[PDB]
Design an enzyme around this catalytic site. Sequence first.
Site, PDB file in Angstrom:
ATOM      1  N   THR A 173      -3.494   1.148  -4.699  1.00 59.12           N
ATOM      2  CA  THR A 173      -4.102   2.431  -5.502  1.00 59.12           C
ATOM      3  C   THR A 173      -3.576   2.260  -7.061  1.00 59.12           C
ATOM      4  O   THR A 173      -2.309   1.916  -7.331  1.00 59.12           O
ATOM      5  CB  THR A 173      -3.906   3.679  -4.844  1.00 59.12           C
ATOM      6  N   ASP A 195      -1.131   2.331   8.080  1.00 57.80           N
ATOM      7  CA  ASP A 195      -1.944   1.476   7.125  1.00 57.80           C
ATOM      8  C   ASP A 195      -1.483   0.311   6.784  1.00 57.80           C
ATOM      9  O   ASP A 195      -0.827   0.093   5.744  1.00 57.80           O
ATOM     10  CB  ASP A 195      -2.654   2.368   6.026  1.00 57.80           C
ATOM     11  N   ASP A 242       0.950  -1.093   0.046  1.00 51.43           N
ATOM     12  CA  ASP A 242       0.090   0.041   0.016  1.00 51.43           C
ATOM     13  C   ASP A 242       1.061   1.477   0.003  1.00 51.43           C
ATOM     14  O   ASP A 242       0.591   2.254   0.634  1.00 51.43           O
ATOM     15  CB  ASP A 242      -1.140  -0.063   1.244  1.00 51.43           C
ATOM     16  N   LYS A 291       1.884   4.731  -1.101  1.00 56.62           N
ATOM     17  CA  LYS A 291       1.323   5.777  -1.796  1.00 56.62           C
ATOM     18  C   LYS A 291       1.744   7.140  -0.592  1.00 56.62           C
ATOM     19  O   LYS A 291       2.060   6.794   0.428  1.00 56.62           O
ATOM     20  CB  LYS A 291       0.061   5.776  -1.934  1.00 56.62           C
ATOM     21  N   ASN A 304      -0.009   7.515   2.911  1.00 60.60           N
ATOM     22  CA  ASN A 304       0.383   6.457   4.017  1.00 60.60           C
ATOM     23  C   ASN A 304       1.786   6.835   4.703  1.00 60.60           C
ATOM     24  O   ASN A 304       2.105   6.157   5.668  1.00 60.60           O
ATOM     25  CB  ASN A 304       0.189   5.034   3.630  1.00 60.60           C
TER      26      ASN A 304
END
Length: 338
Positions: free
Chosen positions: A190, A173, A155, A157, A160
Amino acid sequence: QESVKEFLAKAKEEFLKKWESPSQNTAQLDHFDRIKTLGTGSFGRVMLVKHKETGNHYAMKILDKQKVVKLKQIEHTLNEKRILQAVNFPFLVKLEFSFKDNSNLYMVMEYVPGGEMFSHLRRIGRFSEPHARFYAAQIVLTFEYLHSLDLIYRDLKPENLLIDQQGYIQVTDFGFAKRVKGRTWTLCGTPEYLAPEIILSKGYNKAVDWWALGVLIYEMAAGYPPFFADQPIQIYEKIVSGKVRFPSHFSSDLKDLLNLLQVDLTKRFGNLKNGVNDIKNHKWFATTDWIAIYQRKVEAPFIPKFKGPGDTSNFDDYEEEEIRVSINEKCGKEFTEF
Ligand SMILES: O[C@H]1CN[C@H](c2nc(-c3ccc(F)cc3)no2)C1
């Protein structure tokens, strides 16, 4: 380096002890006052809370069990809590307590008041190469740690990555993190950050995190991501194409490292015989003192502005909704191990 090998061997021993015997039920909701919503999504939210007896502030992630079930996130939610209670590293947000009730699951995390990297990046436009390199080095060390425990993060990005009071990163996260010794198959992440092998529905491995690092470095140094387009299907076509355009202001060393955005996973830096060392020894990182970064001895490029550990001004505003708890237990079986 033997000292690094010994550090990682101890890190895996300590992780495994907590992985095999997870903590449970270490607080309750009425020990905290609710202050403000810091962020929201399809099955959960994050709220600033204050512990009533100590006065300490925390970020409390609240998940609605019935919505977790409906959006097919049961295993992911159990992964998130079991991994977070077992890890320990300078650049990972710390889990302080966890518990459940008739309606919800709760993870009570340290509160990082400087806000998301995403906000600061969008404010200023783009980061200089030294500024991007300071944050990238922290992600390289964090991925070296997580991958040595057989964990994929999945995850990465800018939303985060939180900025702490000393200007260092805290990754938050763990909703898509998973312990994987070989391949895994779930579609998650994403669109702008997905590796080609995820888009093509293949069995993939930890190399997807090194691809995502290439996207993060490009976005920090350019101000926009490398495969940008208006809709996901168009983004995915650019990702699988094998083509990227670099701004002329990028250094030649930065273009050469961005080996990370290699569509063939068997040729991608981080996934060769020398592993992470191909990244750490690359010319773009020649000025980086890896030990000083780990020890938090480097002066950061940017210190966030905030008034104290309760200030929420670096986060945005959301409609404030109730935290309701039913008189009947929901989904008890699905979440037995939480
Ligand atoms: O065609 C117009 C509409 N969108 C373009 C755009 N420019 C950027 C950008 C952001 C940060 C930078 F540092 C540099 C450029 N993002 O979108 C310009």
